[PDB]
PDB file of C-alpha atoms in Angstrom:
ATOM      1  CA  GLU A   1      -3.992 -41.205  57.298  1.00  0.00           C
ATOM      2  CA  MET A   2      -4.081 -37.570  56.199  1.00  0.00           C
ATOM      3  CA  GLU A   3      -0.358 -37.563  55.424  1.00  0.00           C
ATOM      4  CA  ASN A   4      -0.930 -40.541  53.146  1.00  0.00           C
ATOM      5  CA  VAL A   5      -3.754 -38.609  51.474  1.00  0.00           C
ATOM      6  CA  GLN A   6      -1.249 -35.774  50.952  1.00  0.00           C
ATOM      7  CA  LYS A   7       0.996 -38.234  49.129  1.00  0.00           C
ATOM      8  CA  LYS A   8      -2.066 -39.222  47.090  1.00  0.00           C
ATOM      9  CA  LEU A   9      -2.332 -35.531  46.199  1.00  0.00           C
ATOM     10  CA  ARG A  10       1.236 -35.602  44.895  1.00  0.00           C
ATOM     11  CA  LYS A  11       0.530 -38.670  42.749  1.00  0.00           C
ATOM     12  CA  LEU A  12      -2.641 -37.048  41.398  1.00  0.00           C
ATOM     13  CA  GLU A  13      -0.690 -33.860  40.704  1.00  0.00           C
ATOM     14  CA  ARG A  14       1.804 -35.657  38.479  1.00  0.00           C
ATOM     15  CA  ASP A  15      -1.105 -37.371  36.701  1.00  0.00           C
ATOM     16  CA  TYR A  16      -2.621 -33.927  36.074  1.00  0.00           C
ATOM     17  CA  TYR A  17       0.760 -32.768  34.760  1.00  0.00           C
ATOM     18  CA  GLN A  18       0.797 -35.602  32.211  1.00  0.00           C
ATOM     19  CA  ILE A  19      -2.755 -34.823  31.070  1.00  0.00           C
ATOM     20  CA  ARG A  20      -1.834 -31.153  30.681  1.00  0.00           C
ATOM     21  CA  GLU A  21       1.058 -31.881  28.337  1.00  0.00           C
ATOM     22  CA  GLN A  22      -1.272 -34.079  26.292  1.00  0.00           C
ATOM     23  CA  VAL A  23      -3.755 -31.227  25.883  1.00  0.00           C
ATOM     24  CA  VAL A  24      -1.307 -28.519  24.842  1.00  0.00           C
ATOM     25  CA  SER A  25       0.543 -30.757  22.396  1.00  0.00           C
ATOM     26  CA  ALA A  26      -2.758 -31.771  20.787  1.00  0.00           C
ATOM     27  CA  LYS A  27      -3.844 -28.172  20.228  1.00  0.00           C
ATOM     28  CA  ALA A  28      -0.555 -27.398  18.516  1.00  0.00           C
ATOM     29  CA  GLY A  29      -1.595 -29.783  15.718  1.00  0.00           C
ATOM     30  CA  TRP A  30      -5.249 -28.780  15.667  1.00  0.00           C
ATOM     31  CA  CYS A  31      -3.952 -25.331  14.733  1.00  0.00           C
ATOM     32  CA  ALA A  32      -2.235 -26.544  11.578  1.00  0.00           C
ATOM     33  CA  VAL A  33      -5.077 -28.758  10.399  1.00  0.00           C
ATOM     34  CA  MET A  34      -7.669 -26.012  10.765  1.00  0.00           C
ATOM     35  CA  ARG A  35      -5.308 -23.678   8.910  1.00  0.00           C
ATOM     36  CA  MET A  36      -5.113 -25.948   5.869  1.00  0.00           C
ATOM     37  CA  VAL A  37      -8.763 -27.065   5.957  1.00  0.00           C
ATOM     38  CA  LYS A  38      -9.984 -23.541   5.155  1.00  0.00           C
ATOM     39  CA  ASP A  39      -9.897 -24.463   1.458  1.00  0.00           C
ATOM     40  CA  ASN A  40     -13.712 -24.772   1.749  1.00  0.00           C
ATOM     41  CA  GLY A  41     -13.656 -28.348   3.033  1.00  0.00           C
ATOM     42  CA  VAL A  42     -14.454 -27.473   6.642  1.00  0.00           C
ATOM     43  CA  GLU A  43     -17.406 -25.310   5.637  1.00  0.00           C
ATOM     44  CA  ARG A  44     -19.739 -28.299   5.423  1.00  0.00           C
ATOM     45  CA  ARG A  45     -17.958 -31.177   3.680  1.00  0.00           C
ATOM     46  CA  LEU A  46     -15.591 -32.450   6.380  1.00  0.00           C
ATOM     47  CA  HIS A  47     -17.462 -30.980   9.380  1.00  0.00           C
ATOM     48  CA  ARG A  48     -20.240 -33.595   9.446  1.00  0.00           C
ATOM     49  CA  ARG A  49     -21.573 -32.273  12.741  1.00  0.00           C
ATOM     50  CA  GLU A  50     -24.201 -35.028  12.877  1.00  0.00           C
TER      51      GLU A  50
ATOM     52  CA  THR B   1      11.541 -10.261  27.206  1.00  0.00           C
ATOM     53  CA  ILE B   2       9.749 -12.768  29.450  1.00  0.00           C
ATOM     54  CA  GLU B   3       6.464 -11.512  27.990  1.00  0.00           C
ATOM     55  CA  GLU B   4       7.660 -13.111  24.745  1.00  0.00           C
ATOM     56  CA  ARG B   5       6.411 -16.319  26.344  1.00  0.00           C
ATOM     57  CA  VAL B   6       2.811 -15.129  26.661  1.00  0.00           C
ATOM     58  CA  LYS B   7       2.664 -13.221  23.378  1.00  0.00           C
ATOM     59  CA  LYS B   8       4.086 -16.352  21.759  1.00  0.00           C
ATOM     60  CA  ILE B   9       1.927 -18.957  23.497  1.00  0.00           C
ATOM     61  CA  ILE B  10      -1.274 -16.984  22.900  1.00  0.00           C
ATOM     62  CA  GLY B  11      -0.711 -17.120  19.155  1.00  0.00           C
ATOM     63  CA  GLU B  12       0.282 -20.779  19.230  1.00  0.00           C
ATOM     64  CA  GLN B  13      -3.006 -21.434  21.054  1.00  0.00           C
ATOM     65  CA  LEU B  14      -5.262 -19.215  18.908  1.00  0.00           C
ATOM     66  CA  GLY B  15      -3.768 -19.435  15.407  1.00  0.00           C
ATOM     67  CA  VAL B  16      -3.010 -15.694  15.301  1.00  0.00           C
ATOM     68  CA  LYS B  17       0.504 -14.274  15.025  1.00  0.00           C
ATOM     69  CA  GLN B  18       2.434 -12.448  17.740  1.00  0.00           C
ATOM     70  CA  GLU B  19       1.356  -8.941  16.685  1.00  0.00           C
ATOM     71  CA  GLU B  20      -2.266  -9.821  15.873  1.00  0.00           C
ATOM     72  CA  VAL B  21      -3.426  -9.621  19.498  1.00  0.00           C
ATOM     73  CA  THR B  22      -4.351  -6.129  20.701  1.00  0.00           C
ATOM     74  CA  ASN B  23      -4.326  -5.255  24.392  1.00  0.00           C
ATOM     75  CA  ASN B  24      -7.745  -3.577  24.178  1.00  0.00           C
ATOM     76  CA  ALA B  25      -9.503  -6.644  22.749  1.00  0.00           C
ATOM     77  CA  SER B  26     -10.980  -9.630  24.589  1.00  0.00           C
ATOM     78  CA  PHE B  27     -10.229 -13.311  24.023  1.00  0.00           C
ATOM     79  CA  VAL B  28     -13.809 -14.493  24.518  1.00  0.00           C
ATOM     80  CA  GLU B  29     -15.306 -12.653  21.532  1.00  0.00           C
ATOM     81  CA  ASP B  30     -12.679 -10.477  19.809  1.00  0.00           C
ATOM     82  CA  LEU B  31     -10.231 -13.338  19.128  1.00  0.00           C
ATOM     83  CA  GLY B  32     -12.689 -16.086  18.147  1.00  0.00           C
ATOM     84  CA  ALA B  33     -11.659 -18.440  20.962  1.00  0.00           C
ATOM     85  CA  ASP B  34     -14.738 -20.023  22.534  1.00  0.00           C
ATOM     86  CA  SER B  35     -15.066 -21.390  26.073  1.00  0.00           C
ATOM     87  CA  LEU B  36     -13.041 -24.525  25.334  1.00  0.00           C
ATOM     88  CA  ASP B  37     -10.357 -22.577  23.473  1.00  0.00           C
ATOM     89  CA  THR B  38      -9.977 -20.070  26.314  1.00  0.00           C
ATOM     90  CA  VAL B  39      -9.759 -22.892  28.861  1.00  0.00           C
ATOM     91  CA  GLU B  40      -7.032 -24.446  26.718  1.00  0.00           C
ATOM     92  CA  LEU B  41      -5.214 -21.106  26.497  1.00  0.00           C
ATOM     93  CA  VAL B  42      -5.242 -20.467  30.245  1.00  0.00           C
ATOM     94  CA  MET B  43      -4.230 -24.053  30.981  1.00  0.00           C
ATOM     95  CA  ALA B  44      -1.351 -23.863  28.490  1.00  0.00           C
ATOM     96  CA  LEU B  45      -0.243 -20.667  30.226  1.00  0.00           C
ATOM     97  CA  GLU B  46      -0.389 -22.610  33.496  1.00  0.00           C
ATOM     98  CA  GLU B  47       1.766 -25.375  32.009  1.00  0.00           C
ATOM     99  CA  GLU B  48       4.368 -23.028  30.525  1.00  0.00           C
ATOM    100  CA  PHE B  49       5.135 -21.207  33.787  1.00  0.00           C
ATOM    101  CA  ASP B  50       5.003 -24.367  35.952  1.00  0.00           C
ATOM    102  CA  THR B  51       2.504 -22.673  38.268  1.00  0.00           C
ATOM    103  CA  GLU B  52      -1.170 -22.859  39.274  1.00  0.00           C
ATOM    104  CA  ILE B  53      -4.144 -20.558  38.715  1.00  0.00           C
ATOM    105  CA  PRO B  54      -7.440 -21.315  40.515  1.00  0.00           C
ATOM    106  CA  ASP B  55     -10.771 -20.978  38.755  1.00  0.00           C
ATOM    107  CA  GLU B  56     -11.625 -17.570  40.224  1.00  0.00           C
ATOM    108  CA  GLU B  57      -8.366 -15.892  39.209  1.00  0.00           C
ATOM    109  CA  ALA B  58      -8.255 -17.837  35.939  1.00  0.00           C
ATOM    110  CA  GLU B  59     -11.629 -16.380  34.931  1.00  0.00           C
ATOM    111  CA  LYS B  60     -10.159 -12.838  35.035  1.00  0.00           C
ATOM    112  CA  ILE B  61      -8.075 -13.218  31.849  1.00  0.00           C
ATOM    113  CA  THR B  62     -10.783 -12.411  29.284  1.00  0.00           C
ATOM    114  CA  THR B  63      -8.751  -9.405  28.106  1.00  0.00           C
ATOM    115  CA  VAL B  64      -5.452  -9.635  26.247  1.00  0.00           C
ATOM    116  CA  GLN B  65      -3.427  -7.579  28.726  1.00  0.00           C
ATOM    117  CA  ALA B  66      -4.473  -9.629  31.760  1.00  0.00           C
ATOM    118  CA  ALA B  67      -2.355 -12.548  30.532  1.00  0.00           C
ATOM    119  CA  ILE B  68       0.744 -10.572  31.565  1.00  0.00           C
ATOM    120  CA  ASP B  69      -0.789  -8.640  34.456  1.00  0.00           C
ATOM    121  CA  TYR B  70      -1.052 -11.711  36.682  1.00  0.00           C
ATOM    122  CA  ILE B  71       2.264 -13.043  35.346  1.00  0.00           C
ATOM    123  CA  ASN B  72       4.643 -10.153  36.035  1.00  0.00           C
TER     124      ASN B  72
ATOM    125  CA  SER C   1      -8.857 -31.950  48.238  1.00  0.00           C
ATOM    126  CA  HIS C   2      -5.638 -29.923  48.453  1.00  0.00           C
ATOM    127  CA  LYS C   3      -7.295 -27.016  50.252  1.00  0.00           C
ATOM    128  CA  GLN C   4      -9.342 -29.421  52.395  1.00  0.00           C
ATOM    129  CA  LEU C   5      -6.169 -31.203  53.528  1.00  0.00           C
ATOM    130  CA  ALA C   6      -4.520 -27.896  54.437  1.00  0.00           C
ATOM    131  CA  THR C   7      -7.513 -26.897  56.572  1.00  0.00           C
ATOM    132  CA  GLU C   8      -7.649 -30.334  58.196  1.00  0.00           C
ATOM    133  CA  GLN C   9      -3.953 -30.113  59.065  1.00  0.00           C
ATOM    134  CA  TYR C  10      -4.539 -26.784  60.806  1.00  0.00           C
ATOM    135  CA  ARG C  11      -7.436 -28.126  62.883  1.00  0.00           C
ATOM    136  CA  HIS C  12      -5.515 -31.303  63.735  1.00  0.00           C
ATOM    137  CA  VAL C  13      -2.621 -29.231  65.078  1.00  0.00           C
ATOM    138  CA  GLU C  14      -5.020 -27.270  67.286  1.00  0.00           C
ATOM    139  CA  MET C  15      -6.465 -30.419  68.872  1.00  0.00           C
ATOM    140  CA  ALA C  16      -2.970 -31.836  69.401  1.00  0.00           C
ATOM    141  CA  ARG C  17      -1.989 -28.651  71.240  1.00  0.00           C
ATOM    142  CA  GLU C  18      -4.865 -28.768  73.707  1.00  0.00           C
ATOM    143  CA  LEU C  19      -4.216 -32.470  74.355  1.00  0.00           C
ATOM    144  CA  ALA C  20      -0.570 -31.682  75.119  1.00  0.00           C
ATOM    145  CA  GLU C  21      -1.765 -29.259  77.781  1.00  0.00           C
ATOM    146  CA  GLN C  22      -4.041 -31.911  79.284  1.00  0.00           C
ATOM    147  CA  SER C  23      -1.123 -34.379  79.371  1.00  0.00           C
ATOM    148  CA  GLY C  24       0.928 -31.925  81.414  1.00  0.00           C
ATOM    149  CA  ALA C  25      -2.041 -31.362  83.704  1.00  0.00           C
ATOM    150  CA  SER C  26      -2.369 -35.132  84.147  1.00  0.00           C
ATOM    151  CA  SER C  27       1.239 -35.395  85.308  1.00  0.00           C
ATOM    152  CA  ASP C  28       0.671 -32.583  87.815  1.00  0.00           C
ATOM    153  CA  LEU C  29      -2.480 -34.301  89.086  1.00  0.00           C
ATOM    154  CA  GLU C  30      -0.538 -37.546  89.492  1.00  0.00           C
ATOM    155  CA  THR C  31       1.950 -35.696  91.696  1.00  0.00           C
ATOM    156  CA  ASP C  32      -0.866 -34.286  93.826  1.00  0.00           C
ATOM    157  CA  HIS C  33      -2.583 -37.669  94.123  1.00  0.00           C
ATOM    158  CA  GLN C  34       0.664 -39.378  95.115  1.00  0.00           C
ATOM    159  CA  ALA C  35       0.812 -36.892  97.979  1.00  0.00           C
ATOM    160  CA  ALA C  36      -2.853 -37.660  98.716  1.00  0.00           C
ATOM    161  CA  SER C  37      -2.235 -41.411  98.966  1.00  0.00           C
ATOM    162  CA  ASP C  38       0.688 -40.729 101.286  1.00  0.00           C
ATOM    163  CA  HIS C  39      -1.622 -38.593 103.433  1.00  0.00           C
ATOM    164  CA  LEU C  40      -4.222 -41.373 103.635  1.00  0.00           C
ATOM    165  CA  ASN C  41      -1.582 -43.843 104.778  1.00  0.00           C
ATOM    166  CA  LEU C  42      -0.272 -41.353 107.353  1.00  0.00           C
ATOM    167  CA  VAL C  43      -3.712 -40.802 108.895  1.00  0.00           C
TER     168      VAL C  43
ATOM    169  CA  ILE D   1     -30.747 -33.231  29.296  1.00  0.00           C
ATOM    170  CA  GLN D   2     -31.580 -36.811  28.326  1.00  0.00           C
ATOM    171  CA  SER D   3     -34.598 -35.630  26.316  1.00  0.00           C
ATOM    172  CA  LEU D   4     -32.584 -32.919  24.574  1.00  0.00           C
ATOM    173  CA  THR D   5     -29.750 -35.345  23.840  1.00  0.00           C
ATOM    174  CA  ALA D   6     -32.064 -37.927  22.288  1.00  0.00           C
ATOM    175  CA  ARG D   7     -33.664 -35.194  20.171  1.00  0.00           C
ATOM    176  CA  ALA D   8     -30.437 -33.465  19.041  1.00  0.00           C
ATOM    177  CA  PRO D   9     -29.037 -35.667  16.224  1.00  0.00           C
ATOM    178  CA  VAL D  10     -32.283 -35.706  14.245  1.00  0.00           C
ATOM    179  CA  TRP D  11     -32.563 -31.923  14.419  1.00  0.00           C
ATOM    180  CA  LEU D  12     -28.947 -31.561  13.328  1.00  0.00           C
ATOM    181  CA  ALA D  13     -29.352 -33.842  10.291  1.00  0.00           C
ATOM    182  CA  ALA D  14     -32.516 -31.986   9.331  1.00  0.00           C
ATOM    183  CA  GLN D  15     -30.735 -28.636   9.621  1.00  0.00           C
ATOM    184  CA  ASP D  16     -27.849 -29.741   7.400  1.00  0.00           C
ATOM    185  CA  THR D  17     -30.225 -30.874   4.673  1.00  0.00           C
ATOM    186  CA  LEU D  18     -32.256 -27.667   4.985  1.00  0.00           C
ATOM    187  CA  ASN D  19     -29.205 -25.424   4.739  1.00  0.00           C
ATOM    188  CA  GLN D  20     -27.951 -27.294   1.684  1.00  0.00           C
ATOM    189  CA  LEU D  21     -31.376 -27.076   0.059  1.00  0.00           C
ATOM    190  CA  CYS D  22     -32.023 -23.371   0.603  1.00  0.00           C
ATOM    191  CA  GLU D  23     -28.450 -22.391  -0.245  1.00  0.00           C
ATOM    192  CA  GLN D  24     -28.887 -24.325  -3.491  1.00  0.00           C
ATOM    193  CA  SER D  25     -31.741 -21.894  -4.204  1.00  0.00           C
ATOM    194  CA  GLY D  26     -31.567 -18.114  -4.315  1.00  0.00           C
ATOM    195  CA  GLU D  27     -34.121 -17.537  -1.553  1.00  0.00           C
ATOM    196  CA  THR D  28     -33.740 -18.426   2.123  1.00  0.00           C
ATOM    197  CA  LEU D  29     -36.538 -20.352   3.838  1.00  0.00           C
ATOM    198  CA  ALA D  30     -37.714 -19.803   7.406  1.00  0.00           C
ATOM    199  CA  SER D  31     -40.997 -21.690   7.983  1.00  0.00           C
ATOM    200  CA  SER D  32     -43.286 -24.418   6.682  1.00  0.00           C
ATOM    201  CA  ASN D  33     -45.645 -21.919   5.051  1.00  0.00           C
ATOM    202  CA  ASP D  34     -42.618 -20.230   3.485  1.00  0.00           C
ATOM    203  CA  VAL D  35     -41.532 -23.522   1.919  1.00  0.00           C
ATOM    204  CA  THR D  36     -45.044 -24.022   0.530  1.00  0.00           C
ATOM    205  CA  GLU D  37     -45.150 -20.590  -1.100  1.00  0.00           C
ATOM    206  CA  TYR D  38     -41.749 -21.330  -2.618  1.00  0.00           C
ATOM    207  CA  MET D  39     -43.277 -24.518  -4.041  1.00  0.00           C
ATOM    208  CA  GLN D  40     -45.912 -22.402  -5.774  1.00  0.00           C
ATOM    209  CA  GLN D  41     -43.373 -20.004  -7.279  1.00  0.00           C
ATOM    210  CA  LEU D  42     -41.429 -23.016  -8.541  1.00  0.00           C
ATOM    211  CA  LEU D  43     -44.548 -24.325 -10.290  1.00  0.00           C
ATOM    212  CA  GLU D  44     -45.111 -20.984 -12.004  1.00  0.00           C
ATOM    213  CA  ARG D  45     -41.567 -20.980 -13.354  1.00  0.00           C
ATOM    214  CA  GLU D  46     -42.077 -24.532 -14.621  1.00  0.00           C
ATOM    215  CA  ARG D  47     -45.183 -23.595 -16.564  1.00  0.00           C
ATOM    216  CA  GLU D  48     -43.575 -20.498 -18.102  1.00  0.00           C
ATOM    217  CA  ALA D  49     -40.317 -22.137 -19.175  1.00  0.00           C
ATOM    218  CA  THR D  50     -42.268 -25.024 -20.695  1.00  0.00           C
TER     219      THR D  50
END
């Protein structure tokens, strides 16, 4: 049983790997948008924090 | 050299350029990266080097230099 | 779960080791008791 | 946490309107009494300009 749980760990590890690529690739674009938005839009107009 | 990875990735994760980061400064407050941003930075570092960093060790990267200290 | 599985593996190996020793002891005891049954029949 | 979460959005909307309002003026408000005294100064300027 515990060996099969180890193989579960491997499957979960590759799932984690997928999620991790998602996160880093997303930030790469967040960078650009928040660079351009600094033309006073983000101050309060686009950032409707409600 | 290999550090070009870190000093590149850091910028790509924080919006600053390669030379902007100073070894004396701290990510948490002197770079503008909040808790979420620093988590993203450390986790991107984890992804790049195909390795793992537990929570305890990961929390010891608040300073700029540490990003290479644990690497090399 | 990764660290828990490592620890569980270590403990599991320990129990397997002590059971191996008891298996050997059981074979030795079977030898002795075979002799004992022979002795009963001889008496 | 549930109480704070239910309360949050109202407070945030109120804060956005307040920031817009006080920034639209020259003076920065900090309390109910402060807003009232600013009302009075506004009335005085009305009755001089008129």
